[PDB]
Amino acid sequence: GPVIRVAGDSTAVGEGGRWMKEMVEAWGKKTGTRVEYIDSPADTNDRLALYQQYWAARSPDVDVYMIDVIWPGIVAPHALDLKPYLTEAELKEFFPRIVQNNTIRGKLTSLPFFTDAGILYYRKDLLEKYGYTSPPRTWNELEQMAERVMEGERRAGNRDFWGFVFQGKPYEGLTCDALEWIYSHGGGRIVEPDGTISVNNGRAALALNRAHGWVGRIAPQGVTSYAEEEARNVWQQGNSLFMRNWPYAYALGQAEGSPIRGKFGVTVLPKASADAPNAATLGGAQLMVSAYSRYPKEAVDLVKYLASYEVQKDNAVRLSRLPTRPALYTDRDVLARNPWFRDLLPVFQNAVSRPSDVAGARYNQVSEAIWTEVHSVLTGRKKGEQAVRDLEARIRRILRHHHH
Numbered sequence: 413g414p415v416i417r418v419a420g421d422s423t424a425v426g427e428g429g430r431w432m433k434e435m436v437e438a439w440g441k442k443t444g445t446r447v448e449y450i451d452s453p454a455d456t457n458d459r460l461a462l463y464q465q466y467w468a469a470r471s472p473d474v475d476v477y478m479i480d481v482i483w484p485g486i487v488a489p490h491a492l493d494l495k496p497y498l499t500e501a502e503l504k505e506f507f508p509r510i511v512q513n514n515t516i517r518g519k520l521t522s523l524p525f526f527t528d529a530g531i532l533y534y535r536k537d538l539l540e541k542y543g544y545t546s547p548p549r550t551w552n553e554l555e556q557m558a559e560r561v562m563e564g565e566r567r568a569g570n571r572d573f574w575g576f577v578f579q580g581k582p583y584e585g586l587t588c589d590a591l592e593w594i595y596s597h598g599g600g601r602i603v604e605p606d607g608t609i610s611v612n613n614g615r616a617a618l619a620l621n622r623a624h625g626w627v628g629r630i631a632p633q634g635v636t637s638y639a640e641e642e643a644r645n646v647w648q649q650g651n652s653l654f655m656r657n658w659p660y661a662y663a664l665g666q667a668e669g670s671p672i673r674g675k676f677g678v679t680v681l682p683k684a685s686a687d688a689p690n691a692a693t694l695g696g697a698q699l700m701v702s703a704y705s706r707y708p709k710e711a712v713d714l715v716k717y718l719a720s721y722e723v724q725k726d727n728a729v730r731l732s733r734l735p736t737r738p739a740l741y742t743d744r745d746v747l748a749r750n751p752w753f754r755d756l757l758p759v760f761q762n763a764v765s766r767p768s769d770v771a772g773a774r775y776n777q778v779s780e781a782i783w784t785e786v787h788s789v790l791t792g793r794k795k796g797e798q799a800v801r802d803l804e805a806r807i808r809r810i811l812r813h814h815h816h
């Protein structure tokens with residue numbers, strides 16, 4: 413009978429790949445269907461390039477793909493329209509915002525699987541050791557606390573200790589960190605949902621200059637090569653006061669034999685001043701049935717299972733990844749394991765989106781311009797003022813003649 417083949421998530425990032433293959437195998441066993449799991453590179457933009465090879469070839473060799481929240485506009489031609497397979501009631505069990513994200517020109521490209529948002533991880537033991545009673549609310553506070561804790565920890569002999577780690581590698585994760593910096597300084601959304609390229613402004617420039625000011629100071633020099641797992645590993649070995657990362661790092665940092673188990677909390681990222689908006693970049697994964705799958709019916713059943721209440725629950729409890737079902741945020745087991753889901757739910761719902769809706773199929777080119785110009789500031793090659801001006805010019809070229 414059929415073999416349903418699934419490309420999604422990466423065994424190179426936390427436990428996602430392993431857990432996903434487990435879920436797929438469990439569906440296989442439950443239904444008596446053969447399945448195979450195809451692994452992927454770590455970085456989402458590398459995964460896109462890989463999957464684009466299959467799509468270009470109209471390959472039937474993958475039936476289901478896990479896609480990023482930024483992809484529906486790019487991948488729509490390669491997606492089976494899911495809309496005929498779900499009732500309005502079934503669809504309403506997911507966050508409307510994400511269903512809408514995943515719907516391009518009325519086609520439901522994919523089902524919401526897990527969402528995501530950038531948050532601040534902090535060492536509560538260290539904050540208390542140094543006389544602080546709350547995590548920082550402003551970037552200036554983050555910097556002050558990071559300087560003082562680092563000076564103390566370094567003096568006590570931890571030469572590996574830093575104040576802050578984040579994603580500064582030139583790749584999609586940097587676009588995410590940078591949208592947070594820019595938006596939390598009142599500098600806008602880089603490209604606004606109406607199409608306006610707003611990024612050339614003094615607040616955005618300041619946000620980038622501030623980030624530059626972290627590099628090799630409160631953050632490792634090597635941060636300009638860090639993706640999610642590089643940041644996480646410095647943090648999880650106990651060597652960073654703060655980290656910007658996604659929810660998944662929480663369950664990993666609490667696991668038995670984690671050096672930082674019980675020593676950390678999470679909160680909303682800081683901002684420039686009390687009247688700036690809170691910034692958490694919207695991330696996450698959706699499940700797409702390939703337009704080139706020879707087994708659409710079976711693929712859709714697998715996607716419905718993966719997106720189901722109990723599989724999302726398992727994802728939440730075991731991997732601390734965010735459900736796309738509002739009902740799971742009131743589930744007693746989910747909340748008992750992850751009490752911060754309740755506190756940060758409004759942060760997750762107000763998460764700020766990268767400009768994938770407005771750039772559509774050109775999003776990946778837009779994002780590359782963003783991470784390359786941002787990276788130039790992080791390395792001290794350009795000032796934020798120059799970079800945001802060059803970025804405006806590049807995005808104008810990229811999006812000239814594109815309409816949403």
Ligand SMILES: OC[C@H]1O[C@H](OC[C@H]2O[C@@](O)(CO)[C@@H](O)[C@@H]2O)[C@H](O)[C@@H](O)[C@@H]1O
Pocket residue numbers: 421422425426428455456480481482527528584585586588640658659660694695696697
């Ligand atoms: O790097 C940008 C990318 O970050 C997040 O996805 C990357 C991986 O992070 C996870 O651990 C989930 O938090 C893995 O499951 C992902 O493969 C975010 O979800 C993306 O939207 C974002 O583009």
